Amino acid sequence: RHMFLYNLTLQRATGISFAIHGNFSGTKQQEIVVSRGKILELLRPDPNTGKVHTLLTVEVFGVIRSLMAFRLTGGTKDYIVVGSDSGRIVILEYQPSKNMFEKIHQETFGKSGCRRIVPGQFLAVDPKGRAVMISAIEKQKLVYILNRDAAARLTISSPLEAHKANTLVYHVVGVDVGFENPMFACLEMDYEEADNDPTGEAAANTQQTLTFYELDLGLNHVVRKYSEPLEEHGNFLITVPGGSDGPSGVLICSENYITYKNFGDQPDIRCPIPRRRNDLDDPERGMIFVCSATHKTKSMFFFLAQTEQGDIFKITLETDEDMVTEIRLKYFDTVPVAAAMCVLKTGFLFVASEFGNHYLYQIAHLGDDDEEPEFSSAMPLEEGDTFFFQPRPLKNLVLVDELDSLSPILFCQIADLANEDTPQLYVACGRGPRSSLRVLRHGVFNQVAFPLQYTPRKFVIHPESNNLIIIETDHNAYTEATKAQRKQQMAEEMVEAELAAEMAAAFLNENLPESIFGAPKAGNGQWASVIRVMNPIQGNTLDLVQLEQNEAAFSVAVCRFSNTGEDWYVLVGVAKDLILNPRSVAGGFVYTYKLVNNGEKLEFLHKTPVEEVPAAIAPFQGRVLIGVGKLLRVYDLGKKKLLRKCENKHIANYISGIQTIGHRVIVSDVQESFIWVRYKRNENQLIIFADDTYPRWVTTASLLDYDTVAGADKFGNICVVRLPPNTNDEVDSQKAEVIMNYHVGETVLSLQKTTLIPGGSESLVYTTLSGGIGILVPFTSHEDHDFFQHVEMHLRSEHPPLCGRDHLSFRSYYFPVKNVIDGDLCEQFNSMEPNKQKNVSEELDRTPPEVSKKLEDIRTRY
Amino acid sequence: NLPFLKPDDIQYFDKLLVDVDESTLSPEEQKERKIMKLLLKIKNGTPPMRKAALRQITDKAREFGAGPLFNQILPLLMSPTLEDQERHLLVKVIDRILYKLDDLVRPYVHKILVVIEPLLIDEDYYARVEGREIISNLAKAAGLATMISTMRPDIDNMDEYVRNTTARAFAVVASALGIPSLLPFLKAVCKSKKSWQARHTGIKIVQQIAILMGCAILPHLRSLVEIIEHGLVDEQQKVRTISALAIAALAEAATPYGIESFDSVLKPLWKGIRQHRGKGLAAFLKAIGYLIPLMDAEYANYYTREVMLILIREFQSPDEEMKKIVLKVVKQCCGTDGVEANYIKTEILPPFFKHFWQHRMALDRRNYRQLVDTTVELANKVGAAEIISRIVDDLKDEAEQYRKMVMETIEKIMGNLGAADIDHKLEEQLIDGILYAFQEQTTEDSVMLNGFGTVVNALGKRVKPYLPQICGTVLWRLNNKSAKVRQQAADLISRTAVVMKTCQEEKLMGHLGVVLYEYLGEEYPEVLGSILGALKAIVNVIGMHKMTPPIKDLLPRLTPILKNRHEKVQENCIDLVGRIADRGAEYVSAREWMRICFELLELLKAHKKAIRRATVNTFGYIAKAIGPHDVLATLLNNLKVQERQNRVCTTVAIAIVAETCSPFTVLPALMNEYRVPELNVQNGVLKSLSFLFEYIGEMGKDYIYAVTPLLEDALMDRDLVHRQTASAVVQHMSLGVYGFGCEDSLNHLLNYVWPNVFETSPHVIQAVMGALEGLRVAIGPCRMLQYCLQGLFHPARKVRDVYWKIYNSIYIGSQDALIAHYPRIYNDDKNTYIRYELDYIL
Amino acid sequence: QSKYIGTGHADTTKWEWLVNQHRDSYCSYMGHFDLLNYFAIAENESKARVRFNLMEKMLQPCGPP
Amino acid sequence: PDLIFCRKQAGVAIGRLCEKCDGKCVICDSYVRPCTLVRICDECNYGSYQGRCVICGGPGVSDAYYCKECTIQEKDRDGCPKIVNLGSSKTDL
Ligand SMILES: *C[C@@]1(O)C[C@@H](/C=C/C(C)=C/C[C@H]2CC[C@@H](NC(=O)/C=C\[C@H](C)OC(=O)NC)CC2)OC(C)(C)C1
Ligand SMILES: [Zn+2]
Ligand SMILES: [Zn+2]
Ligand SMILES: [Zn+2]
């Protein structure tokens, strides 16, 4: 049977990578434009209730790499500049009447894709809206000039080249130079020296520079004027207000430092980042800022800079008539690590977290009249120490809204664990202390979250007790016992240098909540792992096992054994001293636990050592199948350890997952695609009998039948590969046929064939690392397939993607599309104008309402 | 060697004609000689010569100096026989040498401005652009103080020409360096105590700054207005006029923002309205008219009511410039929010139509266009009838220019606002006046045709009673000695056919069509095309059975008309034949359709695009009509019979049949002709396959498998052109079926295309590379990298050359996609090569 | 073509090609959001720290020749 | 005759084609499916070359377009497609 699927997003992506604020409606109200990755969304936080409403959401069918807002002189509405994975730059204007993003301009300059020398990664606009600049990570950058016409409509000019070969750009930001010629500050670095010195000296000798590009308007050209080398490498720049309301210049954020610099007769004013007092992290680890914000008022202006630990500091500069004397930092608050922050007018702060839920707070105290110690750059500093501060709970901010975000989803199981007619989606997601297992029920989804201790890797379901057996593992983290030992060692070090006897007692008594203050994580090859047994109904953990400070869990499976009775067992694969980059692991251990009290407690039966990391554990006909490195072994339960009875060695690189149906086993390779291996019981050997013709960085897999396997890429793809007919699993040299290919634009870590509504069509549901949920529904007739295919074709040309990308090229990112119709694009038929709808429907010999009903009929059969 | 010299180039480059040695040449004189040579290579030379000479003259500009450089460049720029592109090249070299010689040009600035400033007043737009560009580059090179010093003495000059030129150049240097950099100088000069010429020149500078920079002024509009506002109450009259005109220019530039910057100017202008007269009054009115559309609704109403007394008074002015100014002011006032429609109807419209709408206004063309556009803008707000009824009776007038004026006015009004506001009395007046204006025309003014068509289409079904009255006039007009009037009547039929059909008067249209049928023997081709278009418009709206003449009689009459050499006749005849074939195919035998199709094939290679478009559309229509087989047999016969470009029409027609009828009705017979051993016809079959797949695009997704054997046979050593055309077929297939599950057969054809990658002949290897790129987009860059890695690094150097060319094409084609497709490269002892991030597991 | 960085010829060494594809991979990571998410989940670091480490690796992603 | 493409960074100027070469594509000489509009750099559009034919260099009559095939292969994302002859100056013809 030919496989033709209809792709539909049930739950849109909920993570956020970019967020900007401004008056996009043309009124005094300030909204927020966010990038969900391949989605552009508009949010309006109501200043009366303190809640964020979603007004518009648009699938752009691209990779939004940059997003900024600007405004012309005397203008009342803010435009939206977007740099995509296309070779184009787009300028959009939100129209509140039609409730749409109107593409005002779209200019092409390069090839598509997240390329190395094609602009789109960095975007920087002049603070007066006179010119924008779009730059790549290497070489070329382009400057467009923005103006208005007699009808007050925005006009864009031809690009202006600002290219420089062999130059790596860290970050670009515009400079507020009032109404002089616009200027753009770049953090650049030249690597031409490092590539011609076979000794490596030029590599360590090359240093990051801060460069300035001036756009001469009278001469209409971009010139690279200044280029000063920097002491230490900076990660990004902050545009300080300039002109008549502030001193122009830039703030370079480095590692453990922040430096004001400005061209002309201006000294460099650097200030060390105030480290947290009694920091439980590693002393050799540095501290950097992850994001920033700027709030300008007629009175003053300040910046909000968040650290790696979540500490938001308020930064103010002392004017000193025209040259800044000092940079003043003070501890503002502590929120989860954010990808962007927006200090809205009327007193509200939007925190778009890098993972997990997002937050909206109200400001009450700007930190002006407080007893907390404010830090400056003029204070004497030995360079062997840094400034210390004490973190305290929220006092300047109050939680007014929390937006739910499933990102990042690491595992998902769709099943009816509670005794209801409709199954539920159990999603193990979150990161670190903010991880969670969430139950989702539809009847859009409604969720309930139960917090977890570390980042869950994979969880299995106990068939007899319906309880969930999760493994949680995090890198460079401390276990509970090692955390207590570290606090004890710090208290011991503290009693010598006599208020410290009481201070160390208070330190041991105060346990900072890691869900709000982050987790004290340090070291390189350190690992924190926890096995948990949870009830799907309630939020209670039925059992918990902590592991070694260097033991990291990566696999789990519950199974009965033919060697013993119906009593269940739990096998957990663990690596020791992994050291991810560069890779150099020590050994591995398989925990074999007995399952007692009908799935409520774990009995440590034994630990079996093994060469490398057990990355996959799956039951297989009484015994068990385990993948260690590139070796696929079969184990049977022993009285004291796991006994090996057979192994296969010719696996290509490294096993990342195995699943079995009948006497076949599908080994997923980390880089190569799936491998079909056959196990002959009497011969007691594993023989590879099929592989694939395409390398695929597999993340998950799901066997649809005896011959087909549906898998997901690390690069955001879904493939379906089937064995050819008349394939006897005794002879080798068999190649499998790729019968379906599709690009979701988001990395998928869980594929499962199931049926959401009872009795309906069997579909294939996938989860998204960016917090999304999608489905692929098979087609029933060639009439419906041809109809939806022509709908897709017509919408590709009549309603092209919003950010310059080409839809067919986008869905063909890494492999050409094979037998998948994009329903996310087809449903945009309702968003077109009536003229185009009528024309396309007449091309299909039916009416626009008939097409809308035909589209809506699919969102009931899933 | 030395490039070619025109006659006028001798005067500037004679010294280079003699072959003397530079060792004998005196110094400094020798550097001037090298300048003379570099400029010859710049002006007359190939692009490589030009770029090399530009680089050489810029990198050595400092060593040469400003003196000899400009003393050599300026006489060339003033050459009377200097081409515009040569002037542009000189402008570019001047900019590039000014960037290097920073401040050395300060002594020469004056000697530059005596040469460059005449370009700012040149009629050539690009000459003014070039002059402004080099003045800007000069103002960036030398300091602001240098420019102000060099140009200050010419401010209070006695002549007005030099004052105007200096003001324009000052505006240019302002746009070059920025408004705030010139703000103190302007503030000082606009209040000069010495003479009034200085303040007049400063105000002119501000006006030209406005005109030159437009919306880029809004940041400094308040400053400019505060600097220039004192000039409205000055004692001198010319300075008041120029201050008003500069305020008008600043308002026009800042539209629609920045009204608050003119807060100090409203009352002065308001008083001057009642104080001044003549040219100063005209300037004040112009400034007010450009300032009003910037105001709020209530204040716009207030100010307009305040100025309207004198505005109406100035309607009956003897000055023509005053008339144009007040007409523009009326158009600006009545097009703003705040000026209510009833107010305009009461106070503005009566004097407007009394004084302005006069016969002599339709004589001068500028006044004609101004009054027409202003009246249309008036109707846009006060209503269509309230404007049309006031000049509808002028459609019956003795002076034809006035009739043309009122006709164009009514036409634009009704084309903008429809005909919903027109009552029955006004409808009868419109019909009567339009019939009289059309009936009496000295010549066939197209404005009359457009007005008739627009009014008829706007009335729609309401023109039903007047339809016999119109058709009688049209019939009487078709029987005219003048051909260009018969074609105008035919065009009117073309434009009113749809309304005549809506009015349920198919008998009248049938009479029109049977009258047109006897006119197909018109000796003048343009009238023939017009009547063909009229017949097409009649056929496209009436059923085929009801149409007179019967289609069975009309189409054989149309068949020989395709042989006409005129583009219009061909286009309209083909369009009519296609409209017939689309719905009246049953009324024509297959033999007539075949004869038309064979007389229509030559028109596939017409030079005009529209003719080919129409030919293709009507060929598709007749192919849907007849059926693929009868025409396709003779198509294959003609294909084997003829060669050269004439056959390309056969190829295109085969593709048209394959697209209209499904391609399964032509592909088997098309592949059969590949069996005969003649090498000349197999190439034609391959060309047909190539264009067929390129034309059908995605439709060929169900036919790659069927053609794969013929291709794999043609990819073998049958001939060079065989494999070239087969690779072309593979390219068009891959690009067409891209994204529709054809990876199997295309990956198979790749195995036959690949061995031809080691070919020296240029055209066939180019076709092979095109096929390889098409297969890259269709199969994916992964398979291409898989086939490329096996030869990317090879002991043979030619193998490495070819495979690296392939890899470069793949890389430029899809670099981002290759990340997931690179193989494992184990790190050796001296470097790290494994990408560890891609090995992480969650 | 010499304009497009990353292309090659018959004398392109193994080190040149590998450092080209390593820089291309790093830019692809910086661009595609979920790739960066995966990398920041595997090793516990902030997205900003991961981007900074990649930009630092841009110098000699493989080592000196 | 040694001709080539301009291949400079194209601007906001719309490409233009004369009556001789109207429906033809600037890159591959095809008349099938005009897709994306042709952009050219400012230097090729300046002065007396405003609205000039991109292929030959005569009075242009209609906008120039790449074909669907060249759009698919992204041959429009290259430089300016203006044909320039390296064996002449700015005054020849
Ligand atoms: C600049 C130029 O090269 C232009 C050529 C002109 C060549 C011509 C007119 C060749 C005849 C050729 C035309 C195309 C073929 N038919 C065809 O494509 C038909 C229909 C197409 C699909 O429809 C459209 O394009 N519609 C808009 C027939 C053969 O002349 C010179 C002087 C060489 C200069
Ligand atoms: Zn060009
Ligand atoms: Zn031409
Ligand atoms: Zn083309």
Side-chain angles (χ1 to χ4, degrees), chain A residues 275 281-287 308 476 521-522, chain C residues 44-45:
Chain A
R275 297 296 302 271
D281 292 332
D282 198 77
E284 300 176 346
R285 185 174 182 179
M287 181 62 58
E308 291 186 345
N476 61 68
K521 297 193 182 171
Chain C
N44 210 235
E45 294 293 356

Side-chain angles (χ1 to χ4, degrees), chain B residues 543-601:
Chain B
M544 303 319 223
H545 65 74
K546 202 134 157 85
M547 166 86 189
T548 68
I551 300 201
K552 85 223 201 203
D553 293 2
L554 160 77
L555 178 124
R557 185 61 190 91
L558 298 170
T559 301
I561 313 183
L562 297 174
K563 302 177 181 60
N564 196 331
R565 58 95 179 261
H566 202 259
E567 329 283 320
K568 180 182 179 64
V569 183
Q570 290 183 348
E571 188 169 349
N572 288 113
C573 188
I574 295 172
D575 283 329
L576 177 51
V577 170
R579 287 293 89 189
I580 279 179
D582 192 16
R583 297 171 183 173
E586 56 176 349
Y587 299 89
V588 170
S589 66
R591 195 68 171 184
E592 302 283 325
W593 285 127
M594 200 68 57
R595 190 179 71 261
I596 279 192
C597 155
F598 288 151
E599 208 64 32
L600 193 62
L601 190 123

Side-chain angles (χ1 to χ4, degrees), chain B residues 72-86:
Chain B
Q72 186 82 38
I73 285 185
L74 292 178
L76 282 172
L77 203 52
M78 303 178 302
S79 175
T81 53
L82 189 68
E83 306 280 352
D84 295 333
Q85 297 304 323
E86 299 171 340

Side-chain angles (χ1 to χ4, degrees), chain A residues 13-191:
Chain A
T14 56
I16 293 183
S17 56
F18 299 100
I20 56 182
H21 70 286
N23 309 83
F24 303 107
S25 298
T27 65
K28 302 302 178 63
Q29 304 174 348
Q30 283 191 337
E31 302 86 5
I32 296 180
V33 176
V34 296
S35 173
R36 309 287 194 174
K38 64 168 186 172
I39 302 179
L40 196 64
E41 210 164 350
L42 182 61
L43 312 175
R44 174 185 292 178
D46 189 9
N48 305 324
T49 178
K51 297 183 178 181
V52 175
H53 298 84
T54 294
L55 296 179
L56 181 59
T57 167
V58 174
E59 298 266 356
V60 297
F61 302 95
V63 185
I64 303 180
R65 301 153 69 185
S66 63
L67 178 64
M68 278 195 174
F70 79 98
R71 184 197 298 254
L72 289 181
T73 288
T76 173
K77 190 196 297 182
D78 298 317
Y79 294 108
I80 301 169
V81 187
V82 190
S84 171
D85 68 331
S86 62
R88 305 189 169 101
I89 173 183
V90 283
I91 298 177
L92 288 54
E93 173 190 2
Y94 175 70
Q95 306 290 358
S97 55
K98 301 174 178 297
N99 187 24
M100 75 170 183
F101 286 120
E102 177 177 336
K103 184 193 304 189
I104 300 297
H105 276 300
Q106 176 186 193
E107 295 304 325
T108 323
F109 51 76
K111 307 256 183 191
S112 56
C114 302
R115 287 175 177 259
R116 174 172 151 201
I117 68 178
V118 171
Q121 186 70 34
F122 302 113
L123 195 62
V125 71
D126 172 71
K128 307 308 173 184
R130 299 167 302 171
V132 71
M133 166 170 157
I134 175 168
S135 176
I137 311 184
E138 180 173 8
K139 180 162 185 184
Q140 43 189 284
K141 334 182 221 313
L142 292 159
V143 175
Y144 293 91
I145 297 178
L146 310 170
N147 213 327
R148 65 165 81 264
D149 59 354
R153 192 174 185 267
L154 182 67
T155 66
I156 192 175
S157 74
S158 296
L160 295 177
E161 292 175 336
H163 313 347
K164 174 58 187 307
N166 300 111
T167 294
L168 308 162
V169 173
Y170 281 26
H171 190 259
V172 185
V173 82
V175 183
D176 195 355
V177 290
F179 287 110
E180 228 67 30
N181 293 3
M183 200 161 302
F184 306 101
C186 301
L187 292 180
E188 296 185 351
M189 186 179 301
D190 190 300
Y191 68 86

Side-chain angles (χ1 to χ4, degrees), chain D residues 25 28 67 70:
Chain D
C25 168
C28 68
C67 72
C70 294

